[PDB]
């Protein structure tokens with residue numbers, strides 16, 4: 505199955521100028537926990553934003569152009585990206601905006617972090633139909649000395 509994982513600020517903003525403005529170490533820990541030992545599919549802009557391979561994960565990059573780094577796997581279409589994951593229980597799609605839009609119709613599970621932060625952004629998470637999705641896990645956290653905004657971890661499953 506295909507899952508999307510993303511952190512959303514107010515109004516579904518996910519990025520600005522190819523970066524994420526905020527700093528929420530609790531959410532990065534949640535990201536690592538839910539992606540480790542799984543293949544991760546990302547678009548080329550997100551690859552450039554991360555800047556290095558994610559350890560302990562098969563890194564698959566979507567780009568229309570030839571790859572420029574043999575530490576990761578480069579593919580030229582959605583179908584090729586899926587095939588390059590092989591026969592695994594769960595494929596994690598880690599963005600960005602244009603990649604999320606393409607994989608949302610295939611996905612069975614969404615791992616969403618709702619961050620209570622107002623940030624101007626130039627990239628948004630896709631508008632999803634709420635009726636299609638069942639919330640099976642939610643966990644709210646107030647801000648603290650390490651995490652400057654409150655946040656909610658949520659897992660949705662396609663009904």
Ligand SMILES: NC(=O)c1ccc[n+]([C@@H]2O[C@H](COP(=O)([O-])OP(=O)(O)OC[C@H]3O[C@@H](n4cnc5c(N)ncnc54)[C@H](OP(=O)(O)O)[C@@H]3O)[C@@H](O)[C@H]2O)c1
Nearest residue numbers: 510511519522523547548549550567568599600601602603
């Ligand atoms: N908050 C979060 O959870 C989160 C997660 C991930 C990313 N982000 C943010 O999202 C932003 C990047 O998102 P973005 O929408 O600009 O870009 P993106 O989705 O990361 O990458 C877009 C690029 O991926 C390639 N691509 C996508 N679909 C393809 C396909 N079907 N076939 C071939 N190539 C394909 C193309 O590369 P080529 O131009 O090389 O063909 C395209 O230009 C950054 O701000 C990043 O920080 C946020």
Ligand SMILES: Nc1nc(=O)c2nc(CNc3ccc(C(=O)N[C@@H](CCC(=O)O)C(=O)O)cc3)cnc2[nH]1
Nearest residue numbers: 509510511531532533535536554558559598599617
């Ligand atoms: N929930 C969520 N939060 C995010 O920040 C996020 N970010 C991306 C894309 N960007 C990034 C940027 C950095 C790292 C990163 O450095 N991850 C380390 C951190 C481990 C830690 O600090 O606890 C990793 O090994 O995964 C991952 C994804 C995709 N999905 C997300 N999903």
Ligand SMILES: [Mn+2]
Nearest residue numbers: 514515516622
């Ligand atoms: Mn507004």
Ligand SMILES: [Mn+2]
Nearest residue numbers: 581582583584
């Ligand atoms: Mn297809």
Ligand SMILES: [Mn+2]
Nearest residue numbers: 587590591592
């Ligand atoms: Mn197969």
Ligand SMILES: [Mn+2]
Nearest residue numbers: 620621653654
């Ligand atoms: Mn806030």
Ligand SMILES: [Mn+2]
Nearest residue numbers: 605630631632
């Ligand atoms: Mn749409």
